[PDB]
Amino acid sequence: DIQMTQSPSTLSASVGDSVSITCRASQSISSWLAWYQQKPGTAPKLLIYKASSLESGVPSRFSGRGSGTEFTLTISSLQPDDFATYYCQQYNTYPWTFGQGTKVEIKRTVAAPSVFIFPPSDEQLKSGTASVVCLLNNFYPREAKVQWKVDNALQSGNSQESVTEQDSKDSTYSLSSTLTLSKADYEKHKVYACEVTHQGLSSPVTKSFNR
Amino acid sequence: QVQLQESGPGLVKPSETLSLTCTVSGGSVSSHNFHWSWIRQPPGKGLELIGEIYYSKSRTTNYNPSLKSRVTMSVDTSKNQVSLKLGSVTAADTAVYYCARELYYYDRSGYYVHDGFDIWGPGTTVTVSSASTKGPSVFPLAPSGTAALGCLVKDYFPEPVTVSWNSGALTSGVHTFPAVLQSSGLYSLSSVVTVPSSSLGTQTYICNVNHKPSNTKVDKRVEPKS
Amino acid sequence: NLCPFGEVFNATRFASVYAWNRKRISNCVADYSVLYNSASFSTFKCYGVSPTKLNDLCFTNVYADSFVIRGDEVRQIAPGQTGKIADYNYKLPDDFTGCVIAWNSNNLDSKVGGNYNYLYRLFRKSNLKPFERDISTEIYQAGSTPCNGVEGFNCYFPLQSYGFQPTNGVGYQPYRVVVLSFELLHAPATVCGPK
Numbered sequence: 001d002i003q004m005t006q007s008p009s010t011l012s013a014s015v016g017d018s019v020s021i022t023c024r025a026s027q028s029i030s031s032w033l034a035w036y037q038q039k040p041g042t043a044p045k046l047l048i049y050k051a052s053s054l055e056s057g058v059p060s061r062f063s064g065r066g067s068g069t070e071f072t073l074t075i076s077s078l079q080p081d082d083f084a085t086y087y088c089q090q091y092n093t094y095p096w097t098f099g100q101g102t103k104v105e106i107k108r109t110v111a112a113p114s115v116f117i118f119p120p121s122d123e124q125l126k127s128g129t130a131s132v133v134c135l136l137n138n139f140y141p142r143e144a145k146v147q148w149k150v151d152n153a154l155q156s157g158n159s160q161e162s163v164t165e166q167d168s169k170d171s172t173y174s175l176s177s178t179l180t181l182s183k184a185d186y187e188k189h190k191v192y193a194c195e196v197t198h199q200g201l202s203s204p205v206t207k208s209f210n211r
Numbered sequence: 212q213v214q215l216q217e218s219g220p221g222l223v224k225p226s227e228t229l230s231l232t233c234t235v236s237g238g239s240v241s242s243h244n245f246h247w248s249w250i251r252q253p254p255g256k257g258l259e260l261i262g263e264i265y266y267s268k269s270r271t272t273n274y275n276p277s278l279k280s281r282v283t284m285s286v287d288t289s290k291n292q293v294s295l296k297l298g299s300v301t302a303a304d305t306a307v308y309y310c311a312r313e314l315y316y317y318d319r320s321g322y323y324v325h326d327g328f329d330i331w332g333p334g335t336t337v338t339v340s341s342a343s344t345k346g347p348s349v350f351p352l353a354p355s356g357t358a359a360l361g362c363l364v365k366d367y368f369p370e371p372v373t374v375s376w377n378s379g380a381l382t383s384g385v386h387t388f389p390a391v392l393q394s395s396g397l398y399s400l401s402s403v404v405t406v407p408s409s410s411l412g413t414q415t416y417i418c419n420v421n422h423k424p425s426n427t428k429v430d431k432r433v434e435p436k437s
Numbered sequence: 438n439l440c441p442f443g444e445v446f447n448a449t450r451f452a453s454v455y456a457w458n459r460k461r462i463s464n465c466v467a468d469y470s471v472l473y474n475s476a477s478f479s480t481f482k483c484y485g486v487s488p489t490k491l492n493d494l495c496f497t498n499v500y501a502d503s504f505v506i507r508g509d510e511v512r513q514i515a516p517g518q519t520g521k522i523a524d525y526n527y528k529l530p531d532d533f534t535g536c537v538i539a540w541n542s543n544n545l546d547s548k549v550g551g552n553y554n555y556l557y558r559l560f561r562k563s564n565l566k567p568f569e570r571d572i573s574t575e576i577y578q579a580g581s582t583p584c585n586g587v588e589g590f591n592c593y594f595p596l597q598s599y600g601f602q603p604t605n606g607v608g609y610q611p612y613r614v615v616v617l618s619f620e621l622l623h624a625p626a627t628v629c630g631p632k
């Protein structure tokens with residue numbers, strides 16, 4: 001079983017830069033290597049075959065070369081949509097083996113997050129468990145600190161954070177923090193606030209609500 | 212248009228069998244120029260080729276040696292459906308299973324080659340666990356410039372849930388966050404969208420959530436409440 | 438007698454896609470080597486038969502279909518492919534047992550202003566059946582208003598022109614394509630190779 005080794009594992013560049021992803025082989029795959037772009041939530045879309053030939057619909061920035069044990073894939077001018085995981089596949093010996101992957105993430109100018117605090121729904125409150133949500137809509141870099149304050153109490157524990165991947169048009173991340181509280185514990189307090197610390201934010205931004 | 216659509220279960224009890232079907236549209240599975248393969252991807256991992264089925268029973272199966280003991284691939288020409296069966300299913304087969312096609316040909320030097328996996332399918336998410344299925348509960352995240360609203364999909368198993376906005380009409384600003392496994396063993400997801408504050412009174416908004424494993428499709432209207 | 442493959446390949450003027458030219462090669466000996474040993478072609482894909490295992494093979498009728506396309510569309514000259522060309526101009530059956538040979542012709546089929554002589558069909562109510570030729574010029578209709586011979590609101594002329602200029606990219610550079618189809622019927626085998 002030919003083992004394909006992909007290098008690097010994660011690459012970061014800016015809009016307009018070049019990117020090189022190399023694939024190594026256990027044996028000698030005579031130009032029997034193809035490349036696949038898997039975007040978040042989609043299926044691997046083939047971009048290059050026969051090491052060099054490009055499938056129809058693939059931009060000109062994408063190019064590939066290689067032979068034997070060393071193979072290379074190159075994006076000339078990395079644009080924001082090209083954020084995806086790229087795989088190399090052999091077709092010299094069955095079974096066709098893939099690579100480990102390379103997550104090519106783009107670099108964006110520092111952008112401040114937009115904060116929104118959604119209180120729980122009265123339907124959920126009737127269900128016996130309420131959930132307060134905090135939202136950071138468009139921020140780069142991905143690093144951000146979300147802090148829940150209930151009745152001016154810095155509460156840590158019930159929170160759970162989920163971050164989207166880099167947007168294919170703005171290279172902007174988005175974060176959501178979900179505080180889950182029982183209906184009885186939620187009705188004990190009044191002020192519910194979410195404080196955000198980020199690079200683009202010179203001062204932490206607190207969005208609050210009261211029940 | 213050759214279109215592959217993977218359809219099957221989501222929850223399969225451990226040490227059972229995995230009946231997956233790939234419906235082929237706009238193509239002939241009985242063609243000698245089409246090779247149909249099954250490729251799985253464990254969540255957060257690489258890709259693995261399970262096997263291939265190609266005519267010219269003329270069905271010469273070519274599975275992967277790694278999974279040969281339990282894999283069984285077939286083709287139904289009456290429904291144009293490629294079937295995959297995997298036995299003694301452990302939790303390591305928890306993955307998204309894909310169905311692909313390879314237009315095989317002969318090069319100038321006389322080589323049976325292929326230009327890669329041309330057409331791919333959407334992928335069926337199979338979660339191997341004994342936990343019973345659970346339909347989600349959809350709740351509205353109401354808006355209080357560019358305002359924000361969304362929908363909270365809570366308590367659902369297994370994965371995934373598909374969330375569209377306005378029946379596929381609203382796409383810009385739609386951020387569907389990944390699911391987070393709560394402390395209760397059930398999943399939870401949030402899908403938001405930033406709309407202009409004036410659009411609160413010019414367009415109504417509905418989150419279309421579809422949980423296929425439990426056949427739970429619910430559309431909830433996000434409404435500014437006072 | 439030698440099969441006139443060069444008459445189809447090394448031809449002065451090729452045909453457009455909406456009017457591909459089918460030449461019946463029959464009653465001759467055909468050395469396919471001259472084709473699979475020549476590097477002038479960029480796409481040489483044989484489905485169902487091996488190019489090497491043809492000079493020993495015998496057939497009753499060979500059909501050479503010639504047409505001029507653009508580069509990023511040559512991929513649609515293959516089984517089970519769909520686009521504008523495969524759907525409205527030239528469709529190859531999914532059970533295709535033949536060969537597709539395509540090369541670049543920017544040096545012969547491109548003009549400074551543009552070789553507008555080459556055309557391609559953009560609209561058609563039905564997708565083309567395998568091995569179909571639509572030479573019609575009837576106006577299209579995409580509404581409830583019958584055109585009755587007018588290009589306007591939801592009513593368009595079916596054929597468009599290829600803007601083949603020399604400075605265009607390799608995707609829009611003219612490529613000549615020849616499709617060799619092979620037939621076996623219960624008749625005197627005429628196209629027999631060197632052996």
Ligand SMILES: *[C@@H]1O[C@H](CO)[C@@H](O)[C@H](O)[C@H]1NC(C)=O
Nearest residue numbers: 442443444446447471472475
């Ligand atoms: C076409 O090119 C030259 C014409 O001078 C000819 O000798 C050659 O054999 C031809 N190649 C073909 C028909 O493949």
